[PDB]
């Protein structure tokens, strides 16, 4: 049973530049040295429990970051979703990507597509990756839908509510997020799950990304079980 | 200029249950004794140069609290728009309550609409009230607001964006949001601003809402200033 009651688990993973700065680096290595955070997270929430876990890699303001750095970077996803897309699939995890995929090159998105396709029916953790996304564009795309609705005549504008709006957000059809953790050092959620965080614990580290290990994780969870 | 950089400081003003609970009495003395506060948060942040300071007053969510403390609280509210009005206007403060007023009884509305009206001329500090207020459900005014533009023919469901969205939030013709301060110990933002504090610095600190003072305000500003 979730780790002290904990279904839903957010990380901002952020301090990978601060991480490799610190060792005279540049930030794409600290990048690639947060993929095996990534795999030690995703291992102990599907190991412990949790339903859903959500990771911000790609902000939509990441754009412009240096172009050396953005395509390290998708090429560092390219990577992930050929090497650990079958492990995931062994392991019961269910992959989705949110965000605004149509603004991938072509082969990152049919990748994205076909692991989804192929861990669609998992019934374990369901992963879910942060990608070329934001708050604001996420409950704006559900607005949308809604708006289309009011177009059509199949909607008024009286009958939209809270509710409604909720079942146009992502990840609707999953349990709300119950923690939101930040590594890194900074305080901000910078535009991470705006609408799904509304009320969520909370939890600033100065830990860095790459050295978040399974200890670090269960000192947030027993944060969260503290949460009186 | 604003204490440190901070053009707009938003409080969660919360603990006072917890404040009054600790000497045996109870959440209506401390949400009394919170009155205090406010009293001294507004001299400060209109005396440090900060342009706008929200104050989170009453959750949507609290009309589920006692009936006798609920009560308590709307008596609280009439009798500071009744007392501390006048102080407001000639501090140059301009009065604004967000959040949706059309449930409060008669009197309390009247007042409101006069206090707002009376300062509404007034260029120095901003004084936001959230009462009666959700950040979903001020999402869902701006939305309904759009909704019924697309009703009427003039506006294409396709040129619906976050800026657009964003002038139609509650206020939209402030600075935005920068930093999110909440007393009392716990760490969830609680349906507060959501799409306002994107980028804001989040602030946490045990102090409780009737303690909370000028060392303390200016404490949570030089977190911010060293935001770094
Ligand atoms: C999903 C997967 C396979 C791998 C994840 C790889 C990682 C860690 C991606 C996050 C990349 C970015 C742009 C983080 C922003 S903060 P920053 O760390 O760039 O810089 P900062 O140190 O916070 O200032
Ligand atoms: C605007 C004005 C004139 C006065 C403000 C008066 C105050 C402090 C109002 C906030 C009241 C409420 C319902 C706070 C919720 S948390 P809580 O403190 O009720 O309980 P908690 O201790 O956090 O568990």
Same mark, same amino acid.
């Given at each position: 049973?979730?780790?002290?009651?904990?279904?839903?688990?957010?990380?901002?993973?952020?301090?990978?530049?601060?991480? !490799? *700065?610190?060792?005279?680096?540049?930030?794409?290595?600290?990048?690639?040295?947060?993929?095996?955070?990534?795999?030690? !997270?995703? &291992?102990?929430?599907?190991?412990?429990?949790?339903?859903?876990?959500?990771?911000?890699?790609? &902000?939509?303001?990441?754009?412009?970051?240096?172009? $050396?750095?953005?395509?390290?970077?998708? =090429?560092?996803?390219?990577?992930? /979703?050929?090497?650990?897309?079958?492990? +995931?699939?062994?392991?019961?995890?269910?992959?989705?990507?949110?965000? %605004?995929?149509?603004?991938?090159?072509?082969? +990152?998105?049919?990748?994205?597509?076909? &692991?989804?396709?192929?861990?669609?029916?998992?019934?374990?953790?369901?992963?879910?990756?942060?990608?070329?996304?934001?708050?604001?564009?996420?409950?704006?795309?559900?607005?949308?839908? /809604?708006?289309? *609705?009011? $177009?059509?005549?199949?909607?008024?504008?009286?009958?939209?509510?809270?509710?409604?709006?909720?079942?146009?957000?992502?990840?609707?059809?999953?349990?709300?997020?119950? /923690?939101?953790?930040?590594?890194?050092?900074?305080?901000?959620?910078?535009?991470?799950?705006?609408?799904?965080?509304?009320?969520?614990?909370?939890?600033?580290?100065?830990?860095?990304?790459? %050295?978040? %290990?399974?200890?670090?994780?269960?000192?947030?969870?027993?944060?969260?079980?503290?949460? =009186?």
């Amino acid at each position: 049973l979730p780790a002290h009651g904990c279904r839903h688990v957010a990380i901002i993973m952020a301090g990978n530049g601060r991480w !490799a *700065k610190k060792q005279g680096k540049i930030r794409a290595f600290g990048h690639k040295a947060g993929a095996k955070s990534v795999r030690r !997270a995703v &291992s102990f929430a599907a190991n412990n429990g949790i339903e859903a876990l959500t990771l911000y890699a790609f &902000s939509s303001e990441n754009w412009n970051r240096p172009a $050396q750095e953005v395509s390290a970077l998708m =090429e560092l996803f390219v990577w992930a /979703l050929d090497s650990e897309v079958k492990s +995931l699939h062994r392991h019961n995890v269910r992959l989705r990507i949110i965000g %605004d995929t149509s603004r991938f090159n072509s082969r +990152l998105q049919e990748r994205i597509r076909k &692991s989804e396709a192929l861990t669609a029916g998992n019934t374990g953790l369901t992963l879910n990756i942060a990608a070329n996304y934001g708050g604001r564009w996420d409950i704006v795309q559900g607005v949308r839908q /809604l708006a289309e *609705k009011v $177009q059509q005549g199949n909607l008024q504008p009286d009958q939209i509510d809270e509710e409604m709006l909720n079942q146009h957000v992502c990840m609707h059809e999953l349990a709300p997020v119950d /923690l939101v953790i930040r590594t890194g050092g900074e305080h901000r959620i910078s535009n991470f799950l705006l609408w799904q965080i509304a009320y969520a614990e909370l939890y600033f580290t100065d830990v860095l990304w790459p %050295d978040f %290990d399974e200890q670090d994780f269960e000192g947030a969870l027993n944060a969260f079980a503290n949460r =009186e």
